Amino acid sequence: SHHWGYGKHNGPEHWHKDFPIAKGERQSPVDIDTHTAKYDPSLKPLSVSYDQATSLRILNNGHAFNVEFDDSQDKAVLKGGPLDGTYRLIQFHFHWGSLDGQGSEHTVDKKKYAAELHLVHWNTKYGDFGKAVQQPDGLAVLGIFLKVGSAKPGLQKVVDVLDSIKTKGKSADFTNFDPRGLLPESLDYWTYPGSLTTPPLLECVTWIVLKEPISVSSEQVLKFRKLNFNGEGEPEELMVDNWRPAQPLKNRQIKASFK
Ligand SMILES: [Hg+2]
Ligand SMILES: [Zn+2]
Known part of the structure; x- marks a missing residue:
């Protein structure tokens, strides 16, 4: 190790040495076995209210790029579904691969997608x-898979600013971006109790993973793979394969909002 990352020497299989919770009872991501997920008719539809969302900035933090939102008030919130209370969006980011056949953190019946979006x-x-x-019900992450196909118009503003945050620590002003353009048509989902997928790996997440993927074009995802893990003036290491593999389900049940 040294600092954690996704390389051979500091990758997910090493994390447990600095972050013992890596081998915890509620770690993410997981494989979603569709035939073992329990339909639960008591789960409510999700409520996504992002019409007053305020994006502020886009940042390359060395492990991904985050778009950050103003969370000083209830502007862009998620409620409903399996949640009690109101959860404010703070940031979104992706995980992706070096090839189109990998990249997502969650899998579905062992199927990997090209990428996965997390709305935190x-x-x-x-x-x-x-x-x-620090709380078991402290975060709610909406996860959306991306497959390669048609371009997603609403993702293009993101794609276009990437050249300006190529290396770790770079940021750019990124106002007036509407995250509604990143949702699939359907909000059917699976849910389970899990954790952050990067260190510190805290088990504070209710995951809400949408059944329906969004499509992105090959060119769009190609632009993600041009980012760098390194800082400016350091040897170039492309930012690819920044996904943690599926962890054991242990004593957990995945619930479905649909049948
Ligand atoms: Hg926690
Ligand atoms: Zn993530």
């Missing part, structure tokens, strides 16, 4: 993000 929200009852991650 935190439970307002805890007052701030940093307090939320």
Whole structure:
């Protein structure tokens, strides 16, 4: 190791040495076995209210690129589904692969997608993000798979700014981006209790993974693979394969909102 990453020497199989919770009882991602997920008719439809979303900035943090939102008020929230209370969007980011046949963190019946989008929200009852991650119901992550096919118009503004945040630590102003353009048509989902997928790997997440993938074009995903893990003036290491493999389900049940 040294600092964690996705390489041979500091990749997911090493994390447990600095972050023992890596071998925990509620680690993510998982494989979603569709024939073993339990339909639960008591789950409510999700409620995504992103019409007042305020994006602020896009940042290359060395492991992905995050688009950050103003979370000082209830502007872009998620509620409903399996959640109690209101969760505010704080940031979204992707995980992707070096090839189109891999890239997602969750799998479906062992199927891997080209990428996976995570919309990260935190439970307002805890007052701030940093307090939320210390609680079992502190975050709610919506995960959306991407397959390669048609271009997604609403992703192009993201794609286009990537050249300006090529290396670790770079940021760019990124206002007026509407995350509604990244949702599939259907909001049917699976849900289970899990964790963050990067260190510190805290088990504070209710995952909501959407059944329906979105399509992106090959060119679009190609632009993701041009980013760098390294900082400026360091030897170039392309930012690819920044996904953690599926972890054991252990004593958990995946619930479906649909049949
Ligand atoms: Hg936690
Ligand atoms: Zn993620």
